[PDB]
Amino acid sequence: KKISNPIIPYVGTILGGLVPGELIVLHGSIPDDADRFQVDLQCGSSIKPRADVAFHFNPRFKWSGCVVCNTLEREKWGWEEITYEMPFQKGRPFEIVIMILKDKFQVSVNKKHLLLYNHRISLERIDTLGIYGKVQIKSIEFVSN
Ligand SMILES: OC[C@H]1O[C@@H](O[C@H]2[C@H](O)[C@@H](O)[C@@H](O)O[C@@H]2CO)[C@H](O)[C@@H](O)[C@H]1O
Known part of the structure; x- marks a missing residue:
């Protein structure tokens, strides 16, 4: 569960x-x-x-x-x-961590809290990750409990 x-x-x-x-x-x-x-x-x-x-x-x-x-x-x-914060910077690397919880996603960027988002669709329905737009990705990893 690690993609380079x-x-x-x-x-x-x-x-x-x-x-x-x-x-x-x-x-x-x-x-x-x-x-x-x-x-x-x-x-x-x-x-x-x-x-x-x-x-x-x-x-x-x-x-x-x-x-x-x-x-x-x-x-x-x-x-x-809408979160009126922008931790991403043009020309710079980043790390995004999405923590999955029973009620919410919690997202950190560069080890700093960014936002919370309550589930609207049941978590068990999610089966696909999409990444689109003007971004480069070095790695994708799914980290277990
Ligand atoms: O809500 C996410 C989507 O937004 C779409 O853009 C919205 C826009 O944010 C809103 O203010 C209004 O003007 O309607 C637009 C069209 O729905 C994006 O096009 C879409 O890709 C999502 O990001």
């Missing part, structure tokens, strides 16, 4: 799905000209109709920067939860 230099866009099955207490650990970097990227925890990888996204984590670099989180269900976006 994945191709972006990345779409891959999460072996065994996710359980509370586990981590998803991403090391990567942001290109000099980035606008946004996203990490999506998905129900499958269908394109038409588009796979549900249980957790859409979407850093956006415009202005002072923010991170938009949401859920896509039956091809409709829910209410956005």
Whole structure:
């Protein structure tokens, strides 16, 4: 459950799905000209109709920067939860750690807390990791309890 230099866009099955207490650990970097990227925890990888996204984590670099989180269900976006922080920096490496909990995802970037997001889709439905946009990824790891 460790992938080196994945191709972006990345779409891959999460072996065994996710359980509370586990981590998803991403090391990567942001290109000099980035606008946004996203990490999506998905129900499958269908394109038409588009796979549900249980957790859409979407850093956006415009202005002072923010991170938009949401859920896509039956091809409709829910209410956005926007964190007006930007820990990502153009031209710099990062580490993202997503801690899976019973109630929430908790996300840290570079070992600093970033945000919480309550589950909207049942955790057991998630079977696919997608990474899209202007981002480079050195490694993907799923860390057990
Ligand atoms: O909510 C996540 C998605 O947002 C979409 O953009 C929104 C935008 O944030 C919102 O303010 C409004 O203008 O509608 C847009 C379209 O739904 C993105 O296009 C999408 O990729 C997700 O990030």
